[PDB]
Amino acid sequence: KDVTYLTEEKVYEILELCREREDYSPLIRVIGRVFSSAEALVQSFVDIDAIRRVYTRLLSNEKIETAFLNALVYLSPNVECDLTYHNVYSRDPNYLNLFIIVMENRNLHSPEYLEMALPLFCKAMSKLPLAAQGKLIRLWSKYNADQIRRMMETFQQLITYKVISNEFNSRNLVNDDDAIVAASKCLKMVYYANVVGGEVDTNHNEEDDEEPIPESSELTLQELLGEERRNKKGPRVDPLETELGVKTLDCRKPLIPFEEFINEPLNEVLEMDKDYTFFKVETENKFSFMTCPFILNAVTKNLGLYYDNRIRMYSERRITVLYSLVQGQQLNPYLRLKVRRDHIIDDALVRLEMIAMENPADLKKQLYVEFEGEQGVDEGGVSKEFFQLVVEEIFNPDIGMFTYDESTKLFWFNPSSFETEGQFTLIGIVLGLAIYNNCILDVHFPMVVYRKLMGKKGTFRDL
C-alpha cells in the first residue's frame, strides 16, 4: 500500500494490519521508505500533537525503533547537502518541518542514537540558515522547562560522550571535531530558546553606554575620516541575538539555570589560547567556543579574558616602542603608580586622573605600584597590598562615601555624600584594574551594582 507522505491515520492503517498479520516488516518497509526521504517528511504535515501521538504509539515496539534509527542515519547526510548546496529552505520555508518532526522523538538521547544517528543529525541541523534557526528557537521558547531540560540533556550527553570517547591533545584540538562543533551549535540553538523563554524586561531598564573620548591622535584620524559623531558602535554582537532581538542580558530569569549549560568535561579539555586565536582570526576550517560562551565555565572564560588583556597590554607596549622610534618620545610601558602610604586616595586620584586626561589609553597598561619610601619589585604582592589599603580606606564610614549593612555585610552608595565625583571615579577605576590584573578584592556589593555596571537599571526585584 505504497504512499508518498504519511499521517497519523495512515499509520493506524498499518498498526492494526501488522498486529493482525503478526508482522512488523511491512510497517518497517514503510517507515524506512518514508523517513529516509527529506521530501516525504517535509510534505507530510507542523502537526506537533499528531507527531507526539505517533511517537508515543510507535516507540513501544523495539523492532520499529531500530527502523527509525536506521532511517535517520540515512536521512541526515542528504539534508546537509540540501542546506549546503541547494538552499532548499529558501525555496520552501516548510523544510523546517523535518527537524521539528525528528526532534519530538523521545529516544534520541539513548546511547544507540548518541553514537551515530544524533551526531549526523546535528551536522545537518547546525547548517540551517539564520532565519530558519530564528523560527525554530521562537517555537522552542514555548516549551515546558522539563522539555528544555530534555533537549539540553540530549546535546549535553552528546558533547560529553564525544569528549570522553576521543583523545584530545595539543595536536588534536576539540576545535577540529565536526561532531562536537555541530553539537555545540545545536546546543546554542537550545540556549537561546531558554533565554527567550524566560522572563525578559526590555522596556524599563536600559542605561546609556558612556564611552571615554579617545586620545587626540585617534580623534584627529577619526576627524580626517567621516566619523566625527560615530563614536558608538557596540562590541561584537552575536548574529542570533540580532535575529531574535533579545540579548543574554535582557532575560531576568531563564527556564533552566544558565549554569546547567556549562559542560565541565569540555572545559577540562579546551585550550583557550588557541580558541581565543580562532575567535580573533576567522579560519574556514576551525571553530571557536568563545562564540558559544554559555558552554564555558568562569575559569575558562577568565582565561580567555586574560589573554585579551595580556595581548592588549603587549600591543600598547609595541605602540610605546613605535612612538619612541619615530618621534623619540619616551613613554612608560607600564601603568606605574607611585603613592604615599599617608595619602593613598589622593595620590592615586591625581595620578589616575592626570593619566586619564592626558592619555585615556594609558589605563590599559600593566599595573605596577610603588609606595613612596619602600623598595621592592611589584610581582603582584605590592599591587595586592595597594588594593587592600585602597578598599579599606574607601569603605571607612569616616569618608562617608558608602553605607554598610550589618545584616547582609554589603556596602551601598551613600546618597548624601558631599565627596567629589572624583573618589567615586577612583573606586570605579580600581575595580577595572583589578579585573584587568586578575586580583581578587574584598569588596561586598549587592547584585544590583554589577547589573548597573553592565548598563541595566536596578529594578524592584534587585532590592
Partner 1 sequence: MFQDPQERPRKLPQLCTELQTTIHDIILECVYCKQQLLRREVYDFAFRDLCIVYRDGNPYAVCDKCLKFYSKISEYRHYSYSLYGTTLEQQYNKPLSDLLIRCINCQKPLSPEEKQRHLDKKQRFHNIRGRWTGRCMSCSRS
Partner 2 sequence: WPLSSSVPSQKTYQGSYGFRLGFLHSGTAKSVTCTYSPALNKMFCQLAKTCPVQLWVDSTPPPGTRVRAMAIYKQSQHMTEVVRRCPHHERCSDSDGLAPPQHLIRVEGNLRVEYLDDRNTFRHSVVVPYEPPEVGSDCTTIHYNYMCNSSCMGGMNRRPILTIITLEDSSGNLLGRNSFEVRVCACPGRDRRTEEENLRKK
Place of cell 564610614: 397
Q: Contact region for partner 1 (CB under 8 A) — 55-63, 168-176, 229-237, 402-410?
A: 229-237
Q: Contact region for partner 1 (CB under 8 A) — 49-57, 134-142, 214-222, 352-360?
A: 214-222
Beta strands in 94-230 (DSSP E): 199-200
Q: 187 with 151: CB under 8 angstroms?
A: no
Residue from 22, 167, 228, 284 touching its own copies (CB under 8 A): that is 167
For its own copies, the closer of residues 117 and 266 by Cβ is 117
Q: Contact region for partner 2 (CB under 8 A) — 46-54, 227-235, 302-310, 446-454?
A: 227-235
Q: Which three cell numbers stand for residue 234?
A: 557596540
For partner 2, the closer of residues 228 and 442 by Cβ is 228
> Rounded to whole angstroms, how far apart are CA atoms 369 and 132?
54
CA distances from 31 to 76, 254, 366 (A): 15, 38, 65
- What crossing angle do the helices spanning 145-165 and 118-125 adopt, rounded to 10°? 110
Residue from 17, 19, 56, 84 touching its own copies (CB under 8 A): that is 84
For partner 2, the closer of residues 204 and 230 by Cβ is 230
Q: 148 with 190: CB under 8 angstroms?
A: yes
Q: Which three cell numbers stand for residue 406?
A: 550589618
User: Least CB distance from residue 138 to partner 2, whole Å?
Assistant: 19
CA distances from 107 to 55, 65, 261, 391 (A): 10, 9, 21, 55
Residue from 46, 131, 319, 435 touching partner 1 (CB under 8 A): that is 319
Q: Which three cell numbers stand for residue 366?
A: 600593566
Residue 84 partner contact from partner 1, its own copies, partner 2, none using kind-dependent CB cut-offs of 5 to 8 Å: its own copies
> Rounded to whole angstroms, how far apart are CA atoms 330 and 363?
17
Q: Contact region for partner 2 (CB under 8 A) — 27-35, 223-231, 289-297, 327-335?
A: 223-231
Residues 303-342 contacting partner 2, CB under 8 A: none
The reply to whether 373 sits near partner 1 by the rule CB under 8 A is no
Which residues of the chain form contacts with its own copies (CB under 8 A)?
2, 29, 33, 70, 73-74, 77-78, 80-81, 84-85, 116, 165-167, 169, 171-172
